[PDB]
Write a protein that binds this DNA or RNA. Sequence first.
RNA 1: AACGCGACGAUACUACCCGCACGUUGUAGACGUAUAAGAAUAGGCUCCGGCCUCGUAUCCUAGCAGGCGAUUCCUCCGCCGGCCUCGAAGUGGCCGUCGGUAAUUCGCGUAUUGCAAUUUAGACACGCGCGGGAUCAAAUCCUUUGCAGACGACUUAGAUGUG
RNA 2: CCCACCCAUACCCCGCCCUCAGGGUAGAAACGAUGCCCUGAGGAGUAGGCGGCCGUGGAGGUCAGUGACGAAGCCUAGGGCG
RNA 3: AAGGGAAGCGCUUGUGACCAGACUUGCGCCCGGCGGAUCAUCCGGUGUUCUCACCGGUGCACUCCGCCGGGCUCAGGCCAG
Lengths: 108, 143, 169, 127, 204
Amino acid sequence: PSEAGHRLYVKGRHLSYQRGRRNTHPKTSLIKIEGVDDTAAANFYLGKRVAYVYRAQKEVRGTKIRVIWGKITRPHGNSGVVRAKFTHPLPARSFGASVRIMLYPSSI
Amino acid sequence: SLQPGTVLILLAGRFRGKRVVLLKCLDQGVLLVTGPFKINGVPLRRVNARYVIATSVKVDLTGVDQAKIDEVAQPKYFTAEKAKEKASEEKPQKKPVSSTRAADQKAIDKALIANIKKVDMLASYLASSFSLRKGDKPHLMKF
Amino acid sequence: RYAATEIAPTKSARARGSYLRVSFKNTRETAQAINGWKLQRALTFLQNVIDKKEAVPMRRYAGSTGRTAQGKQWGVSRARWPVKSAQFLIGLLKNAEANADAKGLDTGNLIIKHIQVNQAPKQRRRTYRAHGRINPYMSNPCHIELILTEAESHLSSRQRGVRIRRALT
Amino acid sequence: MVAAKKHVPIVKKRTKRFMRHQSDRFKCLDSAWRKPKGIDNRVRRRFKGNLAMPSIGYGSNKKTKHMMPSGHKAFLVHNVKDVELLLMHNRTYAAEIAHNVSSRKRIDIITRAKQLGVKVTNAKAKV
Amino acid sequence: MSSFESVVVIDGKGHLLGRLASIVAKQLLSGQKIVVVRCEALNISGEFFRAKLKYHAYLRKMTRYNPTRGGPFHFRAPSRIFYKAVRGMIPHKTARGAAALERLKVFEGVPPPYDKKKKMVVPQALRVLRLQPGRKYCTVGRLSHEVGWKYQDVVARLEERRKAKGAAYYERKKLAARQLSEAKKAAAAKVDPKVSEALAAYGY
RNA sequence: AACGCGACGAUACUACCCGCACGUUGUAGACGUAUAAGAAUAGGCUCCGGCCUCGUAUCCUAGCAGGCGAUUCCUCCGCCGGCCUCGAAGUGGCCGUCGGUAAUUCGCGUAUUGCAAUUUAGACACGCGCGGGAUCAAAUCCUUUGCAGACGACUUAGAUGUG
RNA sequence: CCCACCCAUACCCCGCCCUCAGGGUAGAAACGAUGCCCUGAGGAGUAGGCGGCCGUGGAGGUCAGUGACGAAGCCUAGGGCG
RNA sequence: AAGGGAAGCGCUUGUGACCAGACUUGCGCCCGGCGGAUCAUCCGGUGUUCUCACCGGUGCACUCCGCCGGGCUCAGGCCAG
């Protein structure tokens, strides 16, 4: 009987797209890392993988759960918020929503 | 960070978040690792450097058959029969392990556990699974 | 021809009327009121409408219709009594019931599957108005049709292996 | 053969059609693009948030122009002589039988094109 | 420490209204659930007649035709004042703003489900950490009471009962702490020399 | 407040309650979703030794997504019963029984998911099935009333009676 | 006063379309030469000027063109090219 | 299917529904079994672009043409490490 956990990812929250005062660019998204506060800690996670995991209505190939894949590109600002590029822009309803950030590819 | 005979944490795949020992470093990002099998259930297998994490703990590798290791490291040991097992398997039954894999795994892990049981609680550490627990920040922690 | 072409003609009874001198709006409202019901209940309801015992709700064509308590039978306040539309629908329903009897179906278990009221070519009249104008009085006829029927894996290798695991254990 | 010539990837800069202004509000106005000639109209003045206007910039690559996603260029075919015209272009051109060709001549064209290896886009229409 | 939790419960005593509303609104729009207590203990900087004058100007602003609909509904509870600040700080006229406002809950006092939980404070909004000691400040509860809030005494009495139960709970907690200290001493007089020496070096 | 809330009466079916088989059902988005003193900040806490910048803390954390067996352990969880407790939008404690339980150590199984592919796993709500207990309801139309009225709406009365 | 950060169609690098300018292409194994290859630059636009393409009714020639095994027309949350 | 005091329009996702493509193997070798003489060379006639071909003859088991039972090379669609 274990009684432990299984988390191998770092929690993140998709906040918004890269944007100005008016215009928003859905090409890149802004991700807040759990526990990252500064640019050096962000630079640790640059290049790391990221998955937006959601659920749908129809099971297509054995699962009702769909994923969107991407990677961290560069730090954003001084807060450690990271800029992320995905295979497809995020659904824009996932503003303030959970993403799983994977430590592969790893260099440590 | 990775040397012949070092404990790594596999992060992805069937054995995700689990500690094994890297034995030999193959080419094009391929690493030959073993559990050992009798310790944590991981057999002789090859994984990817970009998906492992190298831990500073070094296991005493003296007493292992390097000829056996590189004989296994020859680039057919898995793919040569992979098609045979795929055809054989596809009420459900576990498909049999090859006798060659069984013999080499037995020799290698016999030597490896003989070396491992010297340092304290290393067997338990290798059998235990890796996990991140609230407040654990990978960007600062030393492995 | 009928709009509802997905109902077989050997199990259903249909009635039709063309170029009927009734109000299209009132006929549509009362046909929608009697839609989907049993034949006997529709006939009783239409006779009650003629007798001013029950009223049809005014849902779409409901300009300045006074309220009546009978409207609460429909969750509405605005209801009306289209006697002439009710009479012509009773005529068509009796014709369809006679057709069903001829075909041999059980009249006690028949529902109004399809009902439709369409607009017919308009029939002109003219009346006299002051300031040198003549007012047109196009009457607004409608076609009616009704039909009654008897009431009654490309999984991946990882997925396959994981399912083998849970099947074994 | 079935496979076409190796070609550079077919990239399409824009996929959705250029809709004429106010066509969605007026039903007498069809969706075909018309150049607006107004002096204060914002589609012509190119204000942001308005409909885009066709330009030569949206032009497709010369190497991939007039090519179907299969990698062939469509050729309208009326008969067996037209498919024998397409004979020497198995890897570059495809046969598209005209809409007014009868079923029997369609069968003949399909047979000849199968012998020639020329792909027919609409071989299963009347099957 | 930039951590994600189920619900963050903030004890609002000693917090400045605008700054606390700013932090709460940013968390809400980032996707965190916030529950604020003791909005009657919230504080507003400046002087109390300044705050009362601002609220009286707010009361003056009112629709003519029908005060029943459309007019600015001048909510007089401190919980509603803090909610007004957060709503003005969040884009409430959109789906995302509605979602954030649904993620927010605000109360007077500490209801029973939240008196058993841990209440956190925001250092960037604390009155003691922000206001210069010579400056005056007012209380949202007093402002609400003198503008027309009807339940100052009720929350005061409920707070008194809650503090009594908290005193009893803390008596039990101190007993538990003393017993735990005695147990740790008695056990450390045993364990195994090696174990204790090693746990030390590590840091525990 | 007609999209604010509470209490109570009766609730035929549908299924009202109860247990699980669950659901290709939903969710502004589980993955340890762990953590109650109060009060002051030109002071406070304490076992009365002392301690207080610092929650970069405490708890918890090992076992085929967590097996089977064995020396040793009475530690920690869970469910049901009794006594009490909690009302601000309603819970926790004690005892008991029963079930599970590495704090030390060991053997047998993991292989093949083939070099990664979300580690489909939580919660509440809703829906389909069973088998145990329980009950056999109302409203509107219709007629009537005038304490009401433009029509609606409202106060009333129709089942045996002071009708 | 100092540091860092955010972004415009702007500035820099790359790809693609078009236009213009500058070169090459015959004892032809030779070309929709009105073609093809190399290099660079440039791209807002009212009145106005020039060019090329699309469509309609009818006429000459041609496709030994299509068609009752279905022309034209019409409808289409079915597709392809520009 | 959407709908708390307008609809409608542009960029970009997501859900649902409905669809066009692509792929099904091609090429070449090591074999073996075959079915067979459209191998070469030379001779006669014919036509041309004066050295190139077609016919008729000659030419039949490591020579040429098609099939099969295999093995190997290469190239093959989609998304990725």
